[PDB]
Structure formats: C-alpha cells, structure tokens
C-alpha cells in the first residue's frame, strides 16, 4: 500500500461511466435565488456529494450517525463534504465525439491506425466529406465504390439520392416534351432550356390545363394555390375534379367527358429514374429502397430492374425508381469509431511486418511508425475505439468551483462554461434527433457537438479559441490547466507556496558568525508561532494554546516574557535563507537565527557571493524546517559553515571579499621608498647615520656592503612579533614598513603587517606550525592568495577550523580597511602624462592615414580597419601607461589597490576613469571612427556621451534578453539529468577516458601543455583507472586524484613522462539510472570522495547553468549561450566544418573554377567539394584521420559520431562546451558536462532486429538493448545490431521512460498522448516524479543506501541481544 508506480492508460466508455456517480443532464449550475445547486446540473449534490459534511439537501439527515447512507427524500448521500473534490460525473453524448489529443497531435494516432492523413481525418471528423463503410454495389462515374473511400457531399448525394435537376421555364411558353417522357443530355425541354442529364422529364406545375371535351379545347388557368388531380391524357368523366383549390368556388371540375392535357409547366423536373405503371395496389411505398428483381408494385407482375429509391406518384398511377444505391457512408466520429472497431490489430501488425521488408527506405520508415502505434495498443491492452468519446467525464465541482466571494458576487471557473456549452449542444442534438430534423440541421449540430468537446479538452487547438462572450479572453480548457509554465505541473506540483515562510529586506551583519543570521523578532514570532504557543503554555505566560494565540493577535497584548520564550524556542534550531533566482544549490543556505531588533534580515558578508546578494535593496525568503529530519538535514548538510567549497569547481566559495580583501591587502603590502634608492655604503652604521640625516628613506632599497637591504631592516630588529606590534602601537614603525623580526626561530625581514597576518591565521587555526605552512608571507594578500589559504586550510584542518579562520579574516579585514584610510577622490583617478603624448602620436598617425587615403593607396574598408587598429593600439598603450604610473608613483592609490587586490574593478574600468574611454560601436555593430578621447575624470562631451549610450543600451538589452535563454537552458539540463544519482560504490567497469595533458597547437603545429586550470578542471577529484608511474611516485589504480596529485601529474608532463591520464569518468560508468562513487570522484564541495546517494545530476545541471545565467545578468551574448545551447542540443552548425569520413592522405585541387579536396587512401578516394570561401586547416602532404576537420569551423556532432565513434563525439562535446566557459573565466569541472553528455549518448538505433521483436530504426536506450542482447546471447539467439545515437538535451529529456517527468517538462499533450496509448507505467525512479507525488526523493537521506540505517545505544543493543540469544 505504498504507491510505487503510476500507470496512465486510455479510459473506456465503460470505465468512464464507472467513475461517474451520476449523469449530468442539465447545464444549470445553481439556483439564482436560493443559490443552492440545481438538480441534475454541474453542481448537483445527488451526483457529486453534499455541500457540507453529513447533511442531505432536504436537511433531514444532519449527523455522522447515518454515515454511508443516501437519503430517500433528496438522494444526497450523507457523507463528508470533501467528496465533492473526488466524485466525478459524466455526459452521455448523443453521438460519439473524437478526443482531440489523438487527432491533432502530430503524427495523428487515429490517422496512423486508419492510414488516413491529417487532411482526410479532419474532413471526416468535422463533417466535410463522407467515408464509405459499405459500398452496397455503388458505381461512381463508372468506377465501383470501395470501402474507406472519401465522398464529397455532392458525390454522396448523387449516389444515395440519385441524379435529378429542375429547369425553370420562362412564363407563358410551353415545353415541347410531355409528362413522363424520357429525354437525353442536351435535349431541349422548352425552346429556351436544355437538359443536362438523361432521364424521365415530368411536369412540375402546369400553369394551364387544356381539357378536350367530347360534345372543345376549353382552357383552364391554374393559379399557384391550385393543384391538378388528374393525369395528362386521362379520360375524365363528367363531374370528376380536374384542378383542386382551397376555396371550392374557384375549384375547377369537368363539365363533360374528355381527355385532360397538361400544358405550360412552371418547370420540368428531369430525374434519372425508371417508370413502372401498376395495375393494382403497389407493394412498396415512397422512400423505400429496391434492388433488381424485387416485386415493385403489381404483386410480382411489375418488378424492379435497377437499384434506387422508390417514389410512387399517386396521380400518374406509375411507380418511379430514382436510380441510386443504399450506400453506407457516414461522417464524424461515428464512422471513425466504427473503423477503429473493425480493425484487427493482429492482422494489421502482420501486414505491417510484411511491408517492413520493402527495400525502399521510405516505406519501411512509414511502416515502422504505424507499427509502433499498433504494437503500443496490443501491449497496453487498450482498444483503438476508446479514442472516441461516447461519455465525457465531468470534473468534480470543487476543482471547478462556483464560489461566492468576500462580497456577494459569484466567481466561477472557465470549465463550467465549457461544460455548459457541451451540455447545451448535446441536449439540443437529442431534441433535434427526436424531431426527425433534416440531415443538414443534424450534421451542423453533430459538428458543433464535436467542436464543443474539442474546446473542452483543448481550447484553441483546432479553429479559433473559444472566448467568453463580452470579452476576447480564451476560455481555459483542461489541456491549458495541465500544460505550460502556469499549468498544474510547473505551478502547483514542481513548485508550491509553503507555510512557515517569511521574507524581508537583507542588511549586512559583520558581527554574525558564518553559521548565524539576524532574524527579526516579529518575523520569528510569526514563523515559529506554533512552537511559541506551546512554550508559552509550558511557562506561566498563557493557560493554554488558544489563550496564547489570542494573546499574540494584538501587538499591544504581547508581554515581555513572550520574547524570552521565543529565545528558548529557536535554541539550536536553524532556518533556511533563500534569495531568488536560486541559480545553484547554495542559493538556499541554513543559518542559526539570532533575534534582532528591526525589520531587516542580517546576512553574513562571506555568504553574499554564494547567494549573489548585495545590499542595494535585495530581499530574501526565510523557511523553517519542522521535524527532526528537516532540522538534521539543514544543520548537517545545508548549514552555511559546512558548504565552504564550490560544487562546480571545488575552489572556496565562502572566501574574503571586497572590503575584507582590501583590509588584508593594505596591511600586507609593503612600502617602497625612492629617497635613497641606490646609495652604497661600507658599514650599517654609515647607512643608519645617513637615514638620521634625511639622505636615505627608511624603506629605500640600498646596499650595505654587498647585499641589498633597507634601513628599516637594519635599524629595527625585533625579538618577537609582540615587540614588533608594540612598536607599531607606539608609532615607531607602520604596518607597511619592512623591518627585521624573529618569528619561529627565523630572522625574517618583513613588515609588521605581514607578521600580524601570520598571527591572524595562527590564532584562528590554533596551531602555529600548520598556519606557517598555509600562508605566503612574502607577497601581499590579494584575492587569489586568500582563496588558496582557505582551500589549503580546508584540506589540512577541516570545516570547523576553516570557518573559524574565515571569521578571523573577516573581522581583521573589516577592522583594518576601516582605519587604513581608503577613499575615492577625483585626484585618485590620476591622469597619466603619457596620455597626452599618445593622443598626439595617434593624431599625427591619423592625419598620415588620411593623407595616404587621399592619394588612393588604400580603400574605404582598409582605411576603416587601419583607423580601428591605430585606436585599439593607442587604447592599449594608455591602459599600460595608467597602471605603470600607479605602480611606480602611487603604489597605494585606491583605484590601483582595489584593482590589484581583486577587491573591485578591472584594468578596463580603471582606464575609462584614468585614461580614455576608447572606441564605441554604432547600433549596427560598426564602430565609430572617432573614439571617446576623454575619461570620466575629465568628463565626456554631449556627443561622446550620446555615442557611448549605444553600447550601454545594447549591453543592457542583452542582460535582459539572454537570461531567458540561459534559464531555459538550465531547466533543460535539470530535466535530462535529474535522475542521475550516485547509487553504488563501484560498478566494476574496466573502461575509462584518457584526459589529455597536451593539446595540439595548430598555429605552431605541435603538442603544447594545456593550462593548469584546464588540467585541474579535468583531473582533480578523479579516480585513476590505471596505475601511473611519474617522477618516481607510484599513483596506484583506484586512487582519487587530489590537488597535489594533479600538480605532480602536471609536473611530470613538463618532464615528458606522461601524455595522458586514464581516469574513471561518468562517461564510461556502467551504473544504471546514475553513476557510481568511483566514477564520479570527489564531492567538490568537500574535497573528499562523493557520498553514495548524492543527486549529482542536479548538481551537474546547476553547476553548468549557473555561470551562463550569472554572467549574462552582469561575452556570453555571442559565443556563450548560443554556442553552449547549440552544443548541448547537438544542433548542426550553419557554417559547419568539413571532416574526412575516412583516414588517408589529402590532395588539394584548388582551381579558379571551384575548390575541391581529395582524401586518398590505399584504395579509397573521397571527394569534398568545398566552397571558395573555405578556411582550410590542412595542406597537401598530410595524413588526416577519420573525423578530422579539413575546414575551419564548428564540427557537426552527428557527422563526427558516425565517422569516428561515440568516444570521439563525447570528447568533442565536453571540450567545446568547456572552451566557452573558459573564455569568460568560469572554472567548471568536466564531470558536470560529462554527466549531461552521458545523457545525450544514452539512446541507440536498431539497425538489425535479429532474433528479437524490435523494429529496424527503432530508438531505445543503450542500457536496455545491451541487456536485451545478453539475454538473447544467453539463450542462443542472433543479437540486436544497434547504432550509437546522439540527441540534444531537449530530445533526450522528452524520450525518457517516465511519463510524469517528461509531461512536466514540455509537450504535455504529446507526452501524455503517447503514454496513455502505450499504457506506460512510471516506476518513479528519478527526482521529479517523486516531487510530483510528494514522496521521499531517492537521493540524499532518501536513498536506499542510507535510509534504512538504525541507531541504538549499547544498553538496549546488549539487552536485545542478551534477551534473544539466551534461548
């Protein structure tokens, strides 16, 4: 009784009626006066249940004693009122209606089975053309009619009702034909009209009757209101009626005996029929249908000779058989449902299997697509005709509520309107059918009924969307409810609004510890209200919980002891601080709340970078974990002081920042004086004497005898750091003056600030020796050095001491930056003297370029390029001049120190402040010829400011229009790798990847060592697959590569001892539904082997997508997201490179006509016709390999896969995606990209079915076919020959086994349509499926590896063991 799997399948009309507690027969919702729901309506209590718990409609039963009872007076079951959310109804359709999902979802599921195209299916379903279901021997245009043939309305009318036409004669003229005379096509009936069909021409309305009496051509005038009652050429006896009339006064009779002749017809009706006069009463009547040989009229004497509808003319005393066939052709879902009922899926499968052997590829592909649907219906057990609705389910009323609001007016959902229209049209069709309405009225209503069902199921899918009258807003249908960003999945299942949650503005708390946050008292009172009420009840504050809650309702009613109790409540507990967007996992962190006075949240400075939270108006969400599990997970796993390293790269993420770095850099940097700067002496006493004379400065570099030192190193020699800092306090020396100190038995020559920094680390880590090895004393502490210190401290000491060191660095960095005296003035943006000289040099060269152009030595495009190169060169020269001036003359300049330390700014921004702004681009992308020669200190001109505004707008627009692309990419990556979890320690695989230490350098055409960040991002925290012998050090198999091991491997590569490192990677992992511990490697956030049960798939997607989104909100516009999304989607590039399908020697045949490249082998010679504008990277006399590029550009991933193999494309995809993130300085481990690429290469295509039921070209997971192949091999069968397949993250995520995860991602209509027909059963393997059902995710503490752990003290364990083994 634990939901372990969710199955979706088609619902039969029988099953739909089993769900329903009653048929909804009326569109009425509620009574307009009493507001009580109407009987038999959309809100009927008899169907969906009582409005209020245990109470009938009549109010006779009103208590739980009569549970499970239905009142006889009203019929409402006495039960809970919540059953109205779960009890469904149904609408019994007068005529069947097709489900729009199985019609308009390309490729059509109904059309696939019936072999009907989308055009043909729509025409039949919406009553445009008939379809033949029984020809009944019908002949159309001389060709017999066959089954499944489409007939237009005109064609059906001719076959079913015969061919006939009426010709209106001009008034007065008499036709030359007689009544009951056959004519031919084109024959003249009257002298003004001609026939168009051969048949019996009969008089319609003879305007004048000319009776010939026997005594006499007496003429009678026939008015429209009078009708002739006798035949033409009929002997009428004296007295018999001739022409009848409404008024007997004008009625015309026969005076004497005579013969009646009809003349001047209103029109002649020529019908293709057969006339048979009858002697006695007719054995048939009007409207019947006869076939050759049937006894027609005269008791067997007169018999039919042709098919047709028989109509008898009483006046003419003849029987007319209008030539027609009783063809069985219907429109709409009625015919379609019958077709699906007659299908023999077993017979259809056999025919499709036979057609699957056609050597034509197109027919096999078409047969495969049809056979996949046929196989789906057979295996699922569904029936094809279930796709047509005979009974439409009705949603429970509480899910489509009609609720009164805070006022008095009613609010209702759009589903009630859609249900009402369906009921209104269904009931009207039932009435129309009962009245025997004509076919056009019935056909229009059946078509409208079909559209009503379509609008309810999926509004706007076919035709114009349905809008509520009085507005143009489309009504929200069932498909719209479950699909889209605002659908049920993404808005209510994958994410929810939660209780015990708050939000406020965040301010900086420097006095907080790394694990602490400042939570306002008023937020904490509300967030911890249930816990607080219990605590007040425990103490004497309140008598009980309810009195406690009333006490807290009014602010003035809260005493001072409530706050004391609130302190006791939150003791030990932690809360989750959240800042949106949660790009990575450290966007939610657990903090120990500290109650503060105010309304803003105090955030620790060190967690700001991880949260991407500054204090210009940011807000955060607060969440309170409730149970012991939730608190334990937050305090152990999610605590801020426990997540110190970045999961994406492994480098520290909580590290000193802007103000902290500045304070530490300022005191650790030393002074460089220029007063003395070079004088040489003989004895130190002479040097000291010179200093007292003012000739040489304290820190001026001098030479005493042979060694280069300073006066400070000689004049001030301190026995210990305490004395050195004592001299600083008394003002003898500053923290930046280089002196001589004795520390740890070494006579160091450093500044007191550097010695002070050494003590700062030593006291923080509480171990002098290790802290000495962790720090770099002889350099100023920039961002990079501090980051290395945090990482090294983490490795040597752990999280607790590193967090203590982090807090110590934060305190001293803040303290020293405050008193140091960092400030920004207008003069701090020092203008170099070289700027004026450079601009004059540029102006002279610009004039020289202009003079050369005036003489015609270079074109417009070349001159524009020459101008740009000159200005780009000048801009770079000024940047160097700006920073050279700072380094030589103002080493402590605030702009220089901030830029050098990494606290703030970059040389590009410092140049704009100090040098020149530079070149700017037009809105079209072209750069202006004139640069912005003025910096921000000098002030731009009005024109230069307008020119500079084009790029500021262009950059700001990208910051807004590329976030959606990156956020969409992150969702794709999450949904394709959400199921990847470390599920076991080792999968036992012997495969691996060889991470290259040398990359081919094309410009040099040789192998060069890759960058350290390249090798570290590909080898750090990875298990060695094979033993490596480097530099006399044995790195054995199975050894996790630490950072020291990576550096040793890099050092060995520099010595030419190793070219590539074999490591275990997720690409070669054999673990099903995830990776193993030995193939993933380290948990980069802890620098230790990954723990079993970690959702590395979610970590991988967040690690990749965070830099994409983070950087675009601050490059990625051109070759960032466009290339990464293209690579992750495995899209074919527009300007794709040309690769050789085979290996061999190249032979270029460049000519004026075209460019052609020949790849020559022993017997093979491939020809590649390149375009003229092709940048070839290979020349004649080279040995190219298969898949090696021949032209510069982006390699098509699919062409490379089929030319080289799965390993090559995986290497190419990981490398090229990395090349992007490296360009913008992002460090990201290869594991996360390889996890996503592993999901891309997860599927294969069948090429030879073998001894299996798979189809050629069928796509299935590689793990399944490999398992299938070994099963076939086990029982001695031909294995399935498959082919590796590559697909993008979107296609891979949509083709997963689980329909719940796929439906929540995209194509909810398509995913659910394919799943329901196939009867797919979701095993709930990944994370999204468990989130949707609210289960415990199979990762982290919810993994089967750790979930069943038992904890017990020894006393109970000894007691249980003793009391059980005693027997």
């Amino acid at each position: 009784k634990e939901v372990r799997k969710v199955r979706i399948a088609l619902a039969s009309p029988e099953k739909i009626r089993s769900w329903s507690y009653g048929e909804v027969e009326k569109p009425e919702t509620i009574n307009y006066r009493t507001l009580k729901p109407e009987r038999d309506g959309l809100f009927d209590e008899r169907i969906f249940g009582p409005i209020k718990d245990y109470e009938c409609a009549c109010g006779k039963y009103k208590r739980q004693r009569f549970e499970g009872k239905v009142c006889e007076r009203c019929g409402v079951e006495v039960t809970k009122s919540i059953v109205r959310r779960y009890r469904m109804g149904h609408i019994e359709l007068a005529t069947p209606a097709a489900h729009i999902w199985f019609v308009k979802d390309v490729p059509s599921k109904i059309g696939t089975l019936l072999d009907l195209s989308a055009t043909e299916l729509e025409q039949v379903l919406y009553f445009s053309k008939y379809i033949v279901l029984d020809p009944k021997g019908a002949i159309l245009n001389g060709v017999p009619v066959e089954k499944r043939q489409l007939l237009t309305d005109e064609e059906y009318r001719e076959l079913r009702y015969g061919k006939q036409e009426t010709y209106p004669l001009p008034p007065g003229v008499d036709a030359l034909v007689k009544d009951g005379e056959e004519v031919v096509k084109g024959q003249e009936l009257a002298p003004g009209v001609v026939s168009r069909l051969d048949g019996v021409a009969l008089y319609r309305f003879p305007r004048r009757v000319r009776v010939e009496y026997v005594k006499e051509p007496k003429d009678y005038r026939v008015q429209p209101h009078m009708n002739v009652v006798v035949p033409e050429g009929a002997r009428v006896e004296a007295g018999d009626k001739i022409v009848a009339a409404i008024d007997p006064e004008e009625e015309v009779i026969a005076e004497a005996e005579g013969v009646v002749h009809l003349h001047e017809p209103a029109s002649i009706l020529v019908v293709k029929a057969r006339v048979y006069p009858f002697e006695d009463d007719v054995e048939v009547s009007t409207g019947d249908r006869v076939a050759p040989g049937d006894v027609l009229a005269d008791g067997g004497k007169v018999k039919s000779d042709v098919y047709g509808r028989v109509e008898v003319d009483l006046v003419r005393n003849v029987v007319r058989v209008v030539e027609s066939y009783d063809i069985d052709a219907r429109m709409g879902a009625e015919a379609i449902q019958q077709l699906l009922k007659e299908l023999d899926l077993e017979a259809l499968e056999k025919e499709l299997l036979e057609e699957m052997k056609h050597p034509s590829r197109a027919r096999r592909a078409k047969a495969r697509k049809r056979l996949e649907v046929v196989r789906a219906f057979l295996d699922s057990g569904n029936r094809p005709e279930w796709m047509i609705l005979e009974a439409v389910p009705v949603l429970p009323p509480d899910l489509r509520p009609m609720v009164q609001v805070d006022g008095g007016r009613f609010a209702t959902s759009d589903l009630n309107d859609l249900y009402r229209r369906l009921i209104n049209r269904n009931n009207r069709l039932k009435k129309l059918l009962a009245q025997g309405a004509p076919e056009i009225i019935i056909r229009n209503e059946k078509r409208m009924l079909q559209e009503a069902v379509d609008a309810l199921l999926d509004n706007g899918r076919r035709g114009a969307p349905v809008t509520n009258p009085g507005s143009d807003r489309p009504l929200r249908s069932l498909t719209d409810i479950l699909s889209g960003k605002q659908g049920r999945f993404r808005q209510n299942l994958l994410g929810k609004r939660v209780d015990y949650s708050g939000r406020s503005v965040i301010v900086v708390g420097p006095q907080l510890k790394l694990h602490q946050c400042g939570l306002p008292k008023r937020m904490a009172l509300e967030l911890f209200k249930p816990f607080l009420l219990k605590k007040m009840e425990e103490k004497g504050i309140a008598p009980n919980v309810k009195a406690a809650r009333r006490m807290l309702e009014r602010q003035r009613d809260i005493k001072d002891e409530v706050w004391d109790a609130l302190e006791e409540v939150i003791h030990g507990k932690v809360v989750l601080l959240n800042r949106a967007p949660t790009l990575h996992r450290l966007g939610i962190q657990a903090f120990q709340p500290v109650l503060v006075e105010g309304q803003s949240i105090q955030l620790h400075p060190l967690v700001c970078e991880a949260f991407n939270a500054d204090f210009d108006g940011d807000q955060m969400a607060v969440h309170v974990p409730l149970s012991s599990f939730a608190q334990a997970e937050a305090r152990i796993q999610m605590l801020s002081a426990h997540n110190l390293l970045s999961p994406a790269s492994g480098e520290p993420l909580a590290k000193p920042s802007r103000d902290i770095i500045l304070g530490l850099y300022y005191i650790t940097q030393v002074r460089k004086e220029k007063k003395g700067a070079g004088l040489e002496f003989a004895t130190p006493e002479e040097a000291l004497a010179a200093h007292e004379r003012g000739e040489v400065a304290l820190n001026a570099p001098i030479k005493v005898a042979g060694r280069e030192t300073s006066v400070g190193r000689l004049k001030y020699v301190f026995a210990n750091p305490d004395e050195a800092l004592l001299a600083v306090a008394h003002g003898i020396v500053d923290l930046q003056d280089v002196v001589t100190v004795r520390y740890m038995g070494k006579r160091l020559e450093t500044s007191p600030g550097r010695i002070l920094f050494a003590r700062i680390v030593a006291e923080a880590v509480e171990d002098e020796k290790v802290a000495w090895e962790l720090i770099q004393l002889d350099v100023p502490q920039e961002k990079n050095s501090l980051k290395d210190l945090v990482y090294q401290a983490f490795l040597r000491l752990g999280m607790e001491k590193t967090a203590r060191l982090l807090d110590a660095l934060k305190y001293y960095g803040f303290t020293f930056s405050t008193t140091s005296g960092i400030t920004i003035g207008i003069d701090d943006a020092v203008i170099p003297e070289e700027k004026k000289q450079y601009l004059e040099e540029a102006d002279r060269k610009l004039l020289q370029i202009e003079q050369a152009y005036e003489m015609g030595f270079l074109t417009d495009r070349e001159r524009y390029d020459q101008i740009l190169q000159l200005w780009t060169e000048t801009t770079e020269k000024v940047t160097q001049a700006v920073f050279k001036n700072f380094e030589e003359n103002y080493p402590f300049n605030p702009l220089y120190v901030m830029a050098q330390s990494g606290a703030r700014g970059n040389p590009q921004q410092i140049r704009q402040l100090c040098g020149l702004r530079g070149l700017m681009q037009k809105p079209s992308g072209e750069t202006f010829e004139v640069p912005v020669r003025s910096s921000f200190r000098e002030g731009l001109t009005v024109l230069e400011y307008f020119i500079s505004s084009h790029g500021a707008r262009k950059g700001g627009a990208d910051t807004a229009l590329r976030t959606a692309d990156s956020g969409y990419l992150t969702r794709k990556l999450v949904d394709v790798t959400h199921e990847i979890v470390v599920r076991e320690a080792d999968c036992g695989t012997t495969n691996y990847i060889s991470v290259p230490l040398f990359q081919p350098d094309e410009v040099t055409r040789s192998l060069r060592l890759r960058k350290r960040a390249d090798i570290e991002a590909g080898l750090y925290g990875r298990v060695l697959a094979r033993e490596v012998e480097v530099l006399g050090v044995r790195l054995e198999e199975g050894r996790y590569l630490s950072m020291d091991d990576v550096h040793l491997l890099i050092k060995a590569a520099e010595a030419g001892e190793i070219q590539e490192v074999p490591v275990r990677s997720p690409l070669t992992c054999q673990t099903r539904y995830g990776v193993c511990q030995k193939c993933y490697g380290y948990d980069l956030s802890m620098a230790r082997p990954v723990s079993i049960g970690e959702a590395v798939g979610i970590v991988a997607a967040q690690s990749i997508g965070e830099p994409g989104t983070q950087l675009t909100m601050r490059a990625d516009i051109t070759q960032g997201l466009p290339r990464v999304i293209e690579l992750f989607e495995a899209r074919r590039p527009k300007a794709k490179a040309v690769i050789s399908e085979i290996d061999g020697v190249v032979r270029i045949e460049e000519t004026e006509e075209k460019l052609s490249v020949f790849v020559e082998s022993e017997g093979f010679s491939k020809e590649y016709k390149l375009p003229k504008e092709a940048r070839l990277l290979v020349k004649d006399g080279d040995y190219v390999e298969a898949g090696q590029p021949l032209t510069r550009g982006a390699i098509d991933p699919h062409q490379l896969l089929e030319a080289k193999g799965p390993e090559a494309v995986e290497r190419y995809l990981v490398e090229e995606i990395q090349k992007v993130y490296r360009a913008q300085g992002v460090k990201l481990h290869d594991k996360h990209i390889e996890i996503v690429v592993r999901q891309m290469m997860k599927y294969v295509e069948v090429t030879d079915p073998g001894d299996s039921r798979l189809l050629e070209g069928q796509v299935l997971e590689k793990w399944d076919v490999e398992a299938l192949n070994e099963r076939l091999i086990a029982e001695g069968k031909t294995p399935v020959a498959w082919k590796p397949l590559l697909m993008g993250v979107t296609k891979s995520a949509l083709s997963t086994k689980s329909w719940l995860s796929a439906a929540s991602f995209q194509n909810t209509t398509h995913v659910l349509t394919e799943a329901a027909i196939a009867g797919k059963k979701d095993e709930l393997i990944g994370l999204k499926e468990n989130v949707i059902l609210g289960r415990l995710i199979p990762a982290g503490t919810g993994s089967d590896f750790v979930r069943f752990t038992q904890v017990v003290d020894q006393k109970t364990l000894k007691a249980i063991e003793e009391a059980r083994k005693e027997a």
Partner: protein, 334 residues
Amino acid sequence: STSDPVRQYLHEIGQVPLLTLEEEVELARKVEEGMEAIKKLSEITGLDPDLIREVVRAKILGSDPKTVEEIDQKLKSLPKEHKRYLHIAREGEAARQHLIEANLRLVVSIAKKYTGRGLSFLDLIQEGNQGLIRAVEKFEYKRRFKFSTYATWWIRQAINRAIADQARTIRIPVHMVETINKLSRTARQLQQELGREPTYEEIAEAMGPGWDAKRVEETLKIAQEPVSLETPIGDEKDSFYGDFIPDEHLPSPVDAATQSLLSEELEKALSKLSEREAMVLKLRKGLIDGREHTLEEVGAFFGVTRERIRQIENKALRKLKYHESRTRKLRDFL
C-alpha cells in the same frame, strides 16, 4: 475552408434552392395532407398516431428497428383504400423534410440580428432551426399566407427563449429575464433623457406600480453575472482572481487543532463525572452517536423514564460547572 464552421454551414444551406410560391404551397399542402393521413391511418389501424408518424418518418429518413419493420409491414398489409393513406403519409413526411431544408436561409437572416447576446452565431441558428421545425408543423396553407410570414414568429420565439435560457451561467427564469431586460431598457431611456445615470427611485418610478428602489436594487443584484476565476489582473500574465480567493470551507489547521484540543479537554472533564452521569450528557449532547438524542430516546437505552434522566442530566451538568469553576481549564475554549 472547413476551419470556419459558419462558412461551411452557409455553403451547405446554399445547396438547397429557394422555393417558389407554387412549390411552397405544394409542399405545405403535402405536409398537412400527410399529417391528416397519419391521423386517418391510426384511427383505422388502431395504433398510436405518434407511433405511426415515427414509423413513417423512419422509413423516409432510412438507415427500435425490430418493431419499426413489424409496424411498417403491418401498415403495408392494409387493403388498397388504406394503403393509399400510407402513400400520402410517406409523401407528406418527405415534403416536410424538403420544406424545412429549403427555409434554412430564413433562420440565418433572422438569427444574424441576435448576435452578441450571450450565444454564438451557430447556436442562434440551431435554436432558430428548432423554431423553423415547429413552424412547419403548425403552418396552415389554407389561410393563403406565405411561409416566411408565419415562420418568422416561431424562429424569433425559439431564439429569444434560448437566449433567456442559455446565455447565463447561473440560469434565470424567462419571466425574470424579461424583467431584467425591461429594467435595463427603462434605465437607458431615463439615462439618455436626464443626461446622467438614473437613481433607483427614478428607475422604479418610470417602471410603474409595484416597483420601488428596493426592488430595483434587488433585481440589479440578481442580474450580476459571475466573474471568471481565470481573468488576469495587470499586464503580467501570472495572476488571476483564483489566486486571491481563500477557501473558507475546509477547516484551517488552527481550527482543526482547537477542535481537537476542546475534544480532549472535554473528555478529560467528563472523567470526573459518574459512569452513568457522563454517559447521559455525552448521549444527550450527541458526543457518542454524533446526533443529539432526546430524553425519551436516551431513556430506552438505559430503561429509565423521561423525567428521571433530565434530573441526572442536570445534576451531571451542575457538577461540571463546579469542576470548571475550580479549575478554569475549559473557559478559554468558549
């Protein structure tokens, strides 16, 4: 093509040529003769006239079928003088179908003047078709009036009734819909005459006797259409009325908790009572079976008379008052 249902319908009805006045009279005469023939058939053969007209209609339309042939063959078994009335009945039904088919342009011209009143254009036509069918049944050609003169009354009648019955989510009776329409028309005439929105007193006075400001306000309140739960607010397409309407039906966690707190505190207080005295109150107040019982009904369960139980029920009630006064552990839940 075929994506506009109105265009497809108009093309379908355009395939039936309009009836000349001679054709109209002939078809109208056949329907009346056919209907009379069905009456003559029933009177003689004995079956239900409604039964026979369905059998005749079934044969004409073609395609309970078990009994239709049984009745149809029975009718054909009549002699010649009676089989004749069958023939007029068949032609009359065939002429009724043709007469209805050829007037499908009339309903469209009538129905196009009723759009925008809560029903779609096709819904008006189909309702107009129902009125057109009724017009044919009741039409009499003896009066020499053309069909469009009499059909127009039935076509507009069916369209008006459908609007009064299907244009509102909360259905309002026809008499009240007429009152609402009359009220709106009266208000508009006053509004265009007084140059401002009329007050309820002004609207009631113009309406006539029996109308006051209270009745006008109630009728306007009744005429308030329900508002959709999915109507967006603001330019952002992420907020709807459904996101701001709380659910007041299901008890809140606080309400469910205090109910449990009261229940456990009441049973604890009832422990101090006697075994029978606590039983009487829990049964008189309906704490066991769920429903309040009577002194007589409680009496049958213990075999005690009505008057005695009231005394012990009151005595047990007084003891709880004594216990609550000495503890005050139950006052706060009130």
